[PDB]
Design a protein around this ligand. Structure first.
Ligand SMILES: O=C(O)Cc1cccc2ccccc12
Length: 154
């Protein structure tokens, strides 16, 4: 059976496209991309249609992680179709839980991506107002969390 994961942040231009790209690389490396549906989306509509933040794209290039994405807003359908919805921070979690209670079918388990970190860094902090080093921190956290999630989901 196909497995599926949706990574979510507020705008779907910084953290969530990086998480999605990291995870897709991990499954592709293990020959199992065809067994996974992997995507990312936004809780809000501010950035719909936009490519990832140029600073995040630069970071991904440096690390050889394939990334190609158009920002989109989460839909009611996503709650019915995804097995996991993994978000970045407490604001995202509060918003997603609100949305989940407005649909009839919520198949998805909604969790913080950082709850999977073996190094126990719960929040993947928003790098929007940060610098290149903050994007690097986000990348490194995503690697740790995505590896652990792939290994064993909650
Ligand atoms: O943000 C809201 O509460 C309304 C709302 C906006 C956009 C997508 C949604 C998906 C599921 C449930 C509600 C949703």
């Amino acid at each position: 059976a196909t497995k599926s994961v949706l990574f979510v942040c507020l705008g779907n231009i910084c953290r969530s496209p990086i998480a999605e790209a990291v995870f897709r690389k991990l499954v592709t490396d293990q020959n199992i991309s065809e067994n996974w549906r992997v995507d990312s989306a936004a809780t809000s509509g501010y950035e719909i249609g936009n490519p990832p933040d140029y600073r995040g794209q630069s970071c991904m290039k440096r690390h050889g992680i394939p990334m190609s994405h158009v920002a989109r807003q989460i839909t009611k359908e996503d709650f019915a179709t995804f097995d996991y919805i993994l978000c970045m921070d407490e604001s995202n979690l509060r918003d997603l839980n609100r949305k989940s209670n407005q649909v009839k079918t919520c198949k998805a388990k909604i969790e913080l991506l950082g709850s999977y970190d073996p190094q126990k860094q719960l929040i993947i902090e928003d790098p929007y107002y940060g610098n290149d080093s903050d994007f690097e921190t986000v990348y490194q956290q995503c690697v740790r969390c995505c590896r652990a999630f792939l290994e064993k989901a909650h």
